[PDB]
Design a protein around this ligand. Structure first.
Ligand SMILES: CC(=O)N[C@H]1[C@H](O[C@@H]2[C@@H](OC[C@H]3O[C@H](O)[C@@H](O)[C@@H](O[C@H]4O[C@H](CO)[C@@H](O)[C@H](O)[C@@H]4O[C@@H]4O[C@H](CO)[C@@H](O)[C@H](O)[C@H]4NC(C)=O)[C@@H]3O)O[C@H](CO)[C@@H](O)[C@@H]2O)O[C@H](CO)[C@@H](O)[C@@H]1O
Ligand SMILES: CC(=O)N[C@H]1[C@H](O[C@H]2[C@@H](O)[C@H](O)[C@@H](CO)O[C@@H]2O)O[C@H](CO)[C@@H](O)[C@@H]1O
Ligand SMILES: [Ca+2]
Ligand SMILES: [Ca+2]
Ligand SMILES: [Mn+2]
Ligand SMILES: [Mn+2]
Lengths: 240, 240
């Protein structure tokens, strides 16, 4: 299970409970979601994701309970380009989730091109930190970098303007309260700059009872490193 | 991960993070470690174990840290006989552990007949609740029911006399403090009857850095059900 929690203050190379997909790998005590060359420089056309191995009991039909969960994490992005792409996302999906074919670039390793905006063809809740918004390729995006809440589609149900800061760690707290059904996101930079966004969603109508949680990132023609520095997660089933 | 915790207040049939070995299975929101017939009565010659799927980081060579952990669980034993056997044990072992051949009866599903008392051939720390001690077959046991701490051998390094109460739940708290290296066990029945046993052990010289935790039980010619009712576990790597 009814309750599960784990904490990664750092990510040593000796990992046993992380499922690595695509190009994701551990380097220098952090998870590099997207591929980097020998000099640690980012490269184009790469997708990578990690998931915690144990499944999370998100809700329970029989007992009418839904989990209260919190995910705290920090990441940094770096690129020599003026338009580093494409972004990193914290996501919740069915346990057998894998990288969809062609999900690179602006699809952040979460959606397949053909059904990216078909809400009835997907089962995913994600919080994206999207740094690439060219209106000719990322037609679904607002015209500025943003934090978005994605529910079964790459076209966010809600976005707020966000500032990308090269090489600076962003600390994020994502919380879900089953009583109000509010998914809240609060992100801060070390100088105190803060971003907040909330959305009401009944997770029971979007995801199965058991899910896996993790992160995904991708780079298309433009690129940047997507470094996950720390992560703690806790979930507990509660009556509603 | 550095920290991990999980809680099972009960055991619904829909499990995803438990590894079942032998005859162990879920029945009536509890784990029945040993086989039972259609009427739910215990049968002879059965072994069953469960392990939590995520691996626990017990100690870290690079940082010189060792985990502080706590395991709380409750179980009950019942048998038509008056000489129910053989017992249940909470154990910690390498992640790939499996039921050894011939480990039924008094070996509790934890040791192989030929190496049961050879400390150099095993890697396991267990806390046993042993109800059968006939000296012809269980030659290593004290002559009475007991709780024992087992370190690489079925012959406990430390035991305390214990009372088996048919059908009554025993609440147990097992704690390991890396500062003192004390593995402490406290068991209590609902009326307040308490049993305590402890032993100093350097887990680093007995087990690998990553392990799995779980329970094991067995019945040889004599039998009883070994019902695990609830289980909570928490571990945190600490500097000492
Ligand atoms: C290779 C790969 O993995 N592909 C993914 C794919 O990724 C998409 C891909 O888009 C390619 C380009 O699409 C359009 O042409 C543009 O949006 C272009 O962006 C450049 O041009 C626009 C203007 O037209 C600018 O606004 C934008 O900033 C960018 O500017 C260019 O920047 C570079 C570097 O600074 C500079 O050298 C150029 O001079 C400059 N060009 C111009 C004209 O100014 C896109 O690059 O890559 C995007 C970025 O990574 C992704 O967001 C896209 O999704 O995505 C599909 C899924 O949809 C996936 O299947 C495929 O594998
Ligand atoms: C019938 C059976 O399962 N035999 C196992 C045997 O059991 C012994 C003893 O260990 C038990 O304590 C008592 C009471 O249940 O029954 C028998 O006498 O133990 C062997 C291990 O020493 C197992 O290999 C046998 O499978
Ligand atoms: Ca985008
Ligand atoms: Ca015995
Ligand atoms: Mn977006
Ligand atoms: Mn014994």
């Amino acid at each position: 299970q009814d309750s599960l929690s784990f904490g990664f203050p750092t990510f040593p190379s000796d990992q046993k409970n992380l499922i690595f997909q695509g190009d994701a790998q551990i380097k220098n005590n952090a998870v590099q979601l997207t591929k980097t060359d020998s000099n640690g420089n980012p490269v184009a056309s790469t997708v990578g994701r990690i998931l915690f191995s144990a499944q999370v009991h998100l809700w329970e039909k029989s007992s009418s309970r839904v989990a209260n969960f919190q995910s705290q994490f920090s990441f940094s992005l770096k690129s020599p380009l003026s338009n580093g792409a494409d972004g990193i996302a914290f996501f919740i999906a069915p346990p057998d989730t894998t990288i969809p074919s062609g999900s690179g670039g602006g699809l952040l390793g979460l959606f397949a091109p053909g059904t990216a905006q078909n809400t009835s063809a997907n089962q995913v809740i994600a919080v994206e930190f999207d740094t690439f918004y060219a209106q000719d390729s990322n037609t679904w995006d607002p015209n500025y970098p943003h934090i978005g809440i994605d529910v079964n589609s790459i076209r966010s149900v809600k976005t707020v303007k966000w500032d990308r800061r090269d090489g600076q760690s962003l600390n994020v707290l994502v919380t879900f309260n089953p009583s109000t059904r509010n998914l809240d996101v609060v992100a801060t930079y070390s100088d105190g700059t803060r971003y907040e966004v909330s959305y009401e969603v009944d997770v029971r109508s979007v995801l199965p009872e058991w899910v896996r949680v993790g992160f995904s990132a991708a780079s298309g023609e433009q690129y940047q490193t997507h470094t996950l520095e720390s992560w703690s997660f806790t979930s507990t089933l509660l009556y509603t």
